[PDB]
Design an enzyme around this catalytic site. Structure first.
Site, PDB file in Angstrom:
ATOM      1  N   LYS A   1       0.822  -1.205   0.000  1.00  0.00           N
ATOM      2  CA  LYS A   1       0.000   0.000   0.000  1.00  0.00           C
ATOM      3  C   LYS A   1       0.856   1.255   0.000  1.00  0.00           C
ATOM      4  CE  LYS A   1      -3.729  -2.513   0.298  1.00  0.00           C
ATOM      5  NZ  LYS A   1      -4.477  -2.816  -0.946  1.00  0.00           N
TER       6      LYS A   1
ATOM      7  N   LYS B   1       0.496   5.130  -4.939  1.00  0.00           N
ATOM      8  CA  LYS B   1       1.187   3.895  -5.193  1.00  0.00           C
ATOM      9  C   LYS B   1       1.775   3.900  -6.558  1.00  0.00           C
ATOM     10  CE  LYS B   1      -2.255   1.526  -2.573  1.00  0.00           C
ATOM     11  NZ  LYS B   1      -3.663   1.638  -2.941  1.00  0.00           N
TER      12      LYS B   1
ATOM     13  N   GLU C   1      -7.282  -2.254  -9.626  1.00  0.00           N
ATOM     14  CA  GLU C   1      -8.474  -2.067 -10.438  1.00  0.00           C
ATOM     15  C   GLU C   1      -9.081  -0.708 -10.137  1.00  0.00           C
ATOM     16  OE1 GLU C   1     -11.161  -5.252  -9.905  1.00  0.00           O
ATOM     17  OE2 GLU C   1     -10.196  -6.542 -11.398  1.00  0.00           O
TER      18      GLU C   1
HETATM   19  C1  LIG Z   1      -7.668  -7.689  -9.852  1.00  0.00           C
HETATM   20  C2  LIG Z   1      -7.220  -7.021  -8.586  1.00  0.00           C
HETATM   21  C3  LIG Z   1      -7.405  -5.656  -8.426  1.00  0.00           C
HETATM   22  C4  LIG Z   1      -6.987  -5.043  -7.262  1.00  0.00           C
HETATM   23  N1  LIG Z   1      -7.175  -3.693  -7.113  1.00  0.00           N
HETATM   24  C5  LIG Z   1      -6.768  -3.062  -5.959  1.00  0.00           C
HETATM   25  C6  LIG Z   1      -6.951  -1.691  -5.804  1.00  0.00           C
HETATM   26  O1  LIG Z   1      -7.477  -1.022  -6.690  1.00  0.00           O
HETATM   27  N2  LIG Z   1      -6.528  -1.083  -4.644  1.00  0.00           N
HETATM   28  C7  LIG Z   1      -5.933  -1.828  -3.645  1.00  0.00           C
HETATM   29  O2  LIG Z   1      -5.562  -1.282  -2.611  1.00  0.00           O
HETATM   30  N3  LIG Z   1      -5.748  -3.184  -3.791  1.00  0.00           N
HETATM   31  C8  LIG Z   1      -6.165  -3.805  -4.944  1.00  0.00           C
HETATM   32  N4  LIG Z   1      -5.981  -5.164  -5.083  1.00  0.00           N
HETATM   33  C9  LIG Z   1      -5.324  -5.940  -3.978  1.00  0.00           C
HETATM   34  C10 LIG Z   1      -6.314  -6.720  -3.119  1.00  0.00           C
HETATM   35  O3  LIG Z   1      -6.794  -5.895  -2.086  1.00  0.00           O
HETATM   36  C11 LIG Z   1      -5.587  -7.919  -2.523  1.00  0.00           C
HETATM   37  O4  LIG Z   1      -5.232  -8.821  -3.546  1.00  0.00           O
HETATM   38  C12 LIG Z   1      -6.412  -8.667  -1.489  1.00  0.00           C
HETATM   39  O5  LIG Z   1      -6.662  -7.816  -0.395  1.00  0.00           O
HETATM   40  C13 LIG Z   1      -5.654  -9.919  -1.053  1.00  0.00           C
HETATM   41  O6  LIG Z   1      -4.584  -9.594  -0.191  1.00  0.00           O
HETATM   42  P1  LIG Z   1      -3.063  -9.982  -0.559  1.00  0.00           P
HETATM   43  O7  LIG Z   1      -2.605  -9.184  -1.755  1.00  0.00           O
HETATM   44  O8  LIG Z   1      -2.215  -9.643   0.643  1.00  0.00           O
HETATM   45  O9  LIG Z   1      -2.939 -11.456  -0.866  1.00  0.00           O
HETATM   46  C14 LIG Z   1      -6.389  -5.784  -6.249  1.00  0.00           C
HETATM   47  C15 LIG Z   1      -6.216  -7.152  -6.405  1.00  0.00           C
HETATM   48  C16 LIG Z   1      -6.622  -7.763  -7.574  1.00  0.00           C
HETATM   49  C17 LIG Z   1      -6.411  -9.233  -7.722  1.00  0.00           C
END
Ligand SMILES: Cc1cc2nc3c(=O)[nH]c(=O)nc-3n(C[C@H](O)[C@H](O)[C@H](O)COP(=O)(O)O)c2cc1C
Ligand SMILES: Cc1cc2nc3c(=O)[nH]c(=O)nc-3n(C[C@H](O)[C@H](O)[C@H](O)COP(=O)(O)O)c2cc1C
Lengths: 217, 217
Positions: free
Chosen positions: B14, B74, B165
Site C-alpha cells: 500500500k 502507489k 483495479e
Molecule cells: C484484480 C485485482 C485488483 C486489485 N485492485 C486493488 C486496488 O485497486 N486497490 C488496492 O488497494 N488493492 C487492490 N488489489 C489488492 C487486493 O486488495 C488484494 O489482492 C487482497 O486484499 C488480497 O490480499 P493480498 O494481496 O495480501 O494477498 C487488487 C487485487 C486484484 C487481484
C-alpha cells in the site's frame, strides 16, 4: 530454480504419464496455491473441484465431449485435475464470509475497522452488481488470475500441467451441480507428469517480440 | 524457501519506497514474465505499458482521479508501474502475427502443419467473435491470467507489488491513445519495495478455509 527459468521451461502438457502421481506433499501444496491466490477486494469469488480418483476424473472428462474430445485423455491421464469455478453473482453473504474471516485472522484492531472495511468493500462490489452490472464477468476475471498464479506455481513445484478451455462448461456444471451452488466452470487444469506422447515437450516456446507487445514510458 | 513460502509471504503493497528501484536485471526480468505468460491458443491478446520515469508514471497516475485518488500515490512511489492492456477485438492479422512467429521459432516441421495450426486457431477464435460474441471478454481474461502469473513471479524475484483495479481506464486509455490502437486498460501493477507506511505489510493473510471453497473428488 530461477523463477525466470521456470517461466521459460514450463509448457502445456498434451499427454500425461498415468503412472506418475503427485507426492502427498504436492497434493496439498496445489491446494494451498488455489487458496492463497490474491483477488480484488479479497473477494475470493471462486470454487475448486480437485479430482484425484479415477472415478472423479471420469466425471470431469464427461465435459470433454463434442468438440472438446481431444481434451479427455489429458483429464484422465493426469494425476490431479483442478476445475476452476467462479461465482455467478456477488451476494452479501459471501461478502460477509470474507470480512468475518478477515476479522478472525486478526486484520482488524477494532469492530469499527471491520465495518469500514465491510462498507468499503460493498462500495466497489455495488459498483459492479448495481451500476455496471458486470460482477459476473468481474468475478470470472479473478479466477483467471488464480489460474495464472496456479500454473506458474505447480510449474515451480516440478509438475507438468495444461490449462483447458476446450471443455463443455454446461456439461461440467451439471455433473457437479454447480449452478445451484452458485458457480460456473471456467478453466480445467490437469496436473501431473508428461509422457513421451507429449509432443509439446519437444517443441520450442513462442511469444511475440516486446517491440510489439510492450511500451516503455 | 519454495514457491509456497513465496505465495504465503507476498502481499499487496500500500506504500512504496521511492528510493528503492529495480535493478536493471529485475527490470528486464519482469518484462520476460509479461511476455512469456501462457494464453489460450497462444493468442497473446495483450499489450503492456511499463512506466519507469517520473513523467511516465505521472501520466499513468492521471487515471487515479475521482474515486481512485487513493491509488495515485502507489503509482508514483513504485519503481516500475505496469499497465496490463487487452485487445478490444481479435483480428485476423494478429492471429497471423502469431502463426508467423511460431513458425520462425521452429514449432512447425512443414508448411501444412503451419496451416493446420492456423486453421485450428481460427476454428476456436471464430467461436468467440462469430458464434459466442465474447472475444473481448475472452481476451480480457487471458490478461488477468497474466497478471496472476506476473504477481507471483515478481514475488519470487524479491519484489513487492500491488494489483490495481481502482483506476479510470477511460482516462488511461486516452492518455496513451489506446482505444484507437485496439487496446484497453484492465489492471495497473506497481512493482518495487515497500515502505514503513505500508500498513498491509504488518498484517496477517486471510483466505477462506478450504472446506468452503474447495471440493475433493
Ligand atoms: C484484480 C485485482 C485488483 C486489485 N485492485 C486493488 C486496488 O485497486 N486497490 C488496492 O488497494 N488493492 C487492490 N488489489 C489488492 C487486493 O486488495 C488484494 O489482492 C487482497 O486484499 C488480497 O490480499 P493480498 O494481496 O495480501 O494477498 C487488487 C487485487 C486484484 C487481484
Ligand atoms: C485460458 C487458457 C486455456 C487453454 N486451453 C487449452 C486447451 O483447451 N487445450 C490445449 O491444448 N491447450 C490449452 N491452453 C494452452 C495454450 O495452448 C498454451 O499455453 C499456449 O500455446 C502457450 O504455450 P505454453 O503452454 O507452452 O506456454 C490454454 C491456455 C490458456 C491460458
Amino acid at each position: 530454480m530461477d523463477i525466470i527459468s521456470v517461466a521459460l521451461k514450463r509448457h502445456s502438457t498434451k499427454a500425461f504419464d498415468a503412472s506418475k502421481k503427485l507426492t502427498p506433499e504436492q497434493a496439498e501444496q496445489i491446494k494451498t496455491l488455489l487458496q492463497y491466490s490474491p483477488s480484488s477486494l479479497n473477494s475470493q469469488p471462486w470454487h475448486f473441484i480437485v479430482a484425484s480418483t479415477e472415478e472423479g476424473k471420469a466425471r470431469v472428462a464427461k465435459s470433454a465431449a463434442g468438440n472438446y474430445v481431444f481434451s479427455e485423455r489429458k483429464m484422465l491421464d493426469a494425476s490431479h485435475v483442478v476445475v476452476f469455478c467462479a461465482k455467478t453473482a456477488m451476494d452479501d453473504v459471501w461478502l460477509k464470509l470474507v470480512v468475518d474471516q478477515e476479522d478472525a485472522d486478526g486484520r482488524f484492531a477494532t469492530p469499527e475497522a471491520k465495518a469500514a472495511n465491510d462498507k468499503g468493500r460493498k462500495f466497489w462490489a455495488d459498483m459492479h452488481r448495481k451500476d455496471l452490472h458486470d460482477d459476473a464477468e468481474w468475478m470470472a476475471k479473478q479466477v483467471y488470475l488464480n489460474v495464472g498464479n496456479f500454473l506458474l506455481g505447480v510449474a515451480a513445484l516440478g509438475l507438468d500441467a495444461v490449462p483447458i478451455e476446450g471443455f463443455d462448461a454446461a456439461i461440467l456444471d451439471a455433473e457437479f451441480g454447480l449452478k445451484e451452488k452458485g458457480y460456473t466452470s471456467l478453466v480445467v487444469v490437469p496436473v501431473g507428469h508428461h509422457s513421451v506422447e507429449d509432443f509439446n515437450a519437444t517443441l520450442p516456446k513462442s511469444r511475440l517480440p516486446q517491440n510489439i507487445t510492450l511500451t516503455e514510458v
